[PDB]
Amino acid sequence: MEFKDFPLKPEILEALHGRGLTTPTPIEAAALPLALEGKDLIGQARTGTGKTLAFALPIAERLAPSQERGRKPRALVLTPTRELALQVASELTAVAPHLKVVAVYGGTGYGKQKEALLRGADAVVATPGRALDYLRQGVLDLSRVEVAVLDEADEMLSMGFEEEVEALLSATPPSRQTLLFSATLPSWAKRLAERYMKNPVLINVIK
Amino acid sequence: MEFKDFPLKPEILEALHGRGLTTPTPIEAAALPLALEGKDLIGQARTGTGKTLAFALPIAERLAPSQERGRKPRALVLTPTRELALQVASELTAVAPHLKVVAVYGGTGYGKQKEALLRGADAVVATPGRALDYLRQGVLDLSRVEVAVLDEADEMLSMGFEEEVEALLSATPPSRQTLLFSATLPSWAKRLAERYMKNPVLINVIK
Ligand SMILES: Nc1ncnc2c1[nH]c(=O)n2[C@@H]1O[C@H](COP(=O)(O)O)[C@@H](O)[C@H]1O
Numbered sequence: 001m002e003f004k005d006f007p008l009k010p011e012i013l014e015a016l017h018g019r020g021l022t023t024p025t026p027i028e029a030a031a032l033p034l035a036l037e038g039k040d041l042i043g044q045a046r047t048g049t050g051k052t053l054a055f056a057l058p059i060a061e062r063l064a065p066s067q068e069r070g071r072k073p074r075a076l077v078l079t080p081t082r083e084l085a086l087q088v089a090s091e092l093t094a095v096a097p098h099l100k101v102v103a104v105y106g107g108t109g110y111g112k113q114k115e116a117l118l119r120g121a122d123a124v125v126a127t128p129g130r131a132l133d134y135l136r137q138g139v140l141d142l143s144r145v146e147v148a149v150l151d152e153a154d155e156m157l158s159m160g161f162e163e164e165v166e167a168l169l170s171a172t173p174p175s176r177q178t179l180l181f182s183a184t185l186p187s188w189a190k191r192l193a194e195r196y197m198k199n200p201v202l203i204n205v206i207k
Numbered sequence: 208m209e210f211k212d213f214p215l216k217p218e219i220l221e222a223l224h225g226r227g228l229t230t231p232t233p234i235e236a237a238a239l240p241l242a243l244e245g246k247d248l249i250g251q252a253r254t255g256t257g258k259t260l261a262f263a264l265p266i267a268e269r270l271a272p273s274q275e276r277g278r279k280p281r282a283l284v285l286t287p288t289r290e291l292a293l294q295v296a297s298e299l300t301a302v303a304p305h306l307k308v309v310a311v312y313g314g315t316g317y318g319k320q321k322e323a324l325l326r327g328a329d330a331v332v333a334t335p336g337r338a339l340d341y342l343r344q345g346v347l348d349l350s351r352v353e354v355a356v357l358d359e360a361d362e363m364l365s366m367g368f369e370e371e372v373e374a375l376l377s378a379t380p381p382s383r384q385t386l387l388f389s390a391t392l393p394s395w396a397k398r399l400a401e402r403y404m405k406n407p408v409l410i411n412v413i414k
Binding site for chain 1: 208
């Protein structure tokens with residue numbers, strides 16, 4: 001199946017087409033039917049392998065546009081690094097032209113990102129330490145998150161973000177959809193699946 | 208996604224709708240994009256009903272009608288039990304109305320099944336012992352198999368059919384597509400995968 005073969009809004013298919021994005025990777029191909037219907041998934045694939053559309057398209061498809069000033073984000077993507085936050089945000093912004101996407105990461109000041117959150121966001125793509133700095137401040141409100149994504153969860157674990165990731169997920173409604181990407185499914189990932197996911201389907205494309 | 212949302216032939220969708228089946232189960236939904244594109248998959252789902260369309264629809268879609276007298280099957284579905292051979296043959300028959308499906312199983316004589324095979328077959332659904340016996344007789348020819356399915360591999364193991372299943376797989380062309388369904392993924396299944404499958408994606412829906 002090409003992306004054209006999935007039940008995607010015409011505007012999303014045209015945004016894909018324009019970027020030369022035609023063909024889901026195998027993890028995407030298997031994940032999309034479930035993810036598009038709101039189901040929780042664990043995607044296990046070789047690190048850095050392409051899987052972004054497995055969560056970006058479900059976010060694009062699930063979230064209608066909003067103009068409401070100071071609205072809280074309806075999608076949260078946690079990723080380990082600024083570099084991945086910037087790359088994912090860019091990919092998501094391109095496939096969800098209707099959504100306000102804000103990247104959040106430390107190693108710079110608070111003002112700029114604080115002002116974006118306070119203005120409005122539909123999707124936040126965040127490194128966990130900086131994201132948590134915001135929740136306890138009262139600036140990041142996670143009470144409307146509909147879709148949470150854990151990107152490169154093994155790296156988040158190796159970096160020592162376990163407690164931050166958990167606290168951030170705990171600040172979201174358990175009624176959300178959760179998508180977990182882990183190369184190796186270590187004990188922490190399995191704890192996440194048990195504590196923070198609902199009957200998640202495992203898709204493993206490490207051949 | 209409903210079955211109508213996949214790229215299936217209209218006559219196959221009509222066959223499904225005529226059986227009252229509109230919606231894939233999660234295993235079916237996640238499997239179909241890859242299976243319809245000819246890729247190998249391991250589907251980990253509970254024993255019993257709920258998985259047939261993950262292999263029956265790819266078989267229906269992949270195989271064009273043929274009228275050749277005495278033709279050899281292009282799909283082989285192995286089941287652990289005689290009851291399931293009959294059940295799966297019936298299910299496949301219904302969704303592939305353009306194909307001749309022949310059930311092969313013990314617990315009865317050899318004549319009717321042998322006559323059916325000699326007349327010709329597009330798909331054979333078999334228990335492993337009877338299938339290997341007909342292979343040895345030169346009645347069942349597996350040289351044209353394009354799709355091989357192992358439905359309920361765990362029971363095949365517990366019943367002691369490992370040798371027979373491996374011999375049958377070995378008798379088919381390695382160019383084929385292979386779909387393996389297992390509730391537990393025991394070692395034997397993993398070694399079958401390693402030997403007989405091509406970079407399979409694993410999809411585990413067990414709750
Ligand atoms: N279906 C798809 N087609 C093309 N590029 C994709 C894709 N899904 C996906 O995530 N990408 C990109 O592929 C990148 C990874 O590619 P890699 O490093 O494995 O060559 C990801 O970071 C994305 O930028």
